[PDB]
Amino acid sequence: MEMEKEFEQIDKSGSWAAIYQDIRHEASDFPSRVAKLPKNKNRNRYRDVSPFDHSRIKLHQEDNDYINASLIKMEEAQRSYILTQGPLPNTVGHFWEMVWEQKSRGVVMLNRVMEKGSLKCAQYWPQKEEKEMIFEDTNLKLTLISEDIKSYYTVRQLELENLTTQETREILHFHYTTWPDFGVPESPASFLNFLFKVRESGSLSPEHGPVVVHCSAGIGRSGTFCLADTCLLLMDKRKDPSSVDIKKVLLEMRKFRMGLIQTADQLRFSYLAVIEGAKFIMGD
Secondary structure (H helix, E strand, C coil), X not given: CCHHHHHHHHHXXXXXXXXXXXXXXXXXXXXXXXXXXXXXXXXXXXXXXCCCHHHEEECCCCCCCEEEEEEEEECCCCEEEEEECCCCCCCHHHHHHHHHHCCECEEEECCCCEECCEECCCXXXXXXXXXXXXXXXXXXEEEEEEEEECCCEEEEEEEEEECCCCEEEEEEEEEECCCCCCCCXXXXXXXXXXXXXXXXXXXXXXXXXXXXXXXXXXXCHHHHHHHXXXXXXXXXXXXXXXXXXXXXXHHHHCCCCCCCCCCHHHHHHHHHHHHHHHHHXXXX
């Protein structure tokens, strides 16, 4: 069924909450035993958001290999993503260790450091060229190279140095700065423009490690970003683009991380973004 008609049907009948609860009921349940170990309690932002054991990213250290992060591997679309929580004061060094070890080119951030008057993640990158950051627990140095501030997003060039080997790499930071404190955006236009800027940089392409994408918990806004990207790519690749089923793609993604898409409003917004984005993919 052409999702544009499915959309109008759900909208006229006002059944978004019913559709969304069906997804919640059918979603995979896999163990998350490592996340729940007592030694990892201060590595998790939220008690009810954890990576599954089978898909979690492991840090390359013998001490404690745990980070709240998951590998989402989309086989037909030939895309992979790492979805993670916003870093905590005690996990900023782990976060950049993961970026280094997984050979990522881009980091996608979908929240502000403060929202609703409370801290949603640590200030984990430097704000001034001449004030670099050193993460002593993981032996990394991070420098701000340049910053381009636009009306709806900011893009930063960063240098990450492995102090053990003195290798350096360029990381791109894509920061969507205008998601509202409550609800979802009224139009998907600026979010789609942002997605296309990430694509254009190479950060989603197979010559690099998976992009790292986060919000506060790494499931809601972050889920919307990867769901929209994968659905638009499948519409490009297939003979019959109307065969792409957004609910089926979301359930596939939920085999790899729990809770992706947090509200019925985020589900509607995901449909809207794919419908409006397709009017470029197809040929317009």
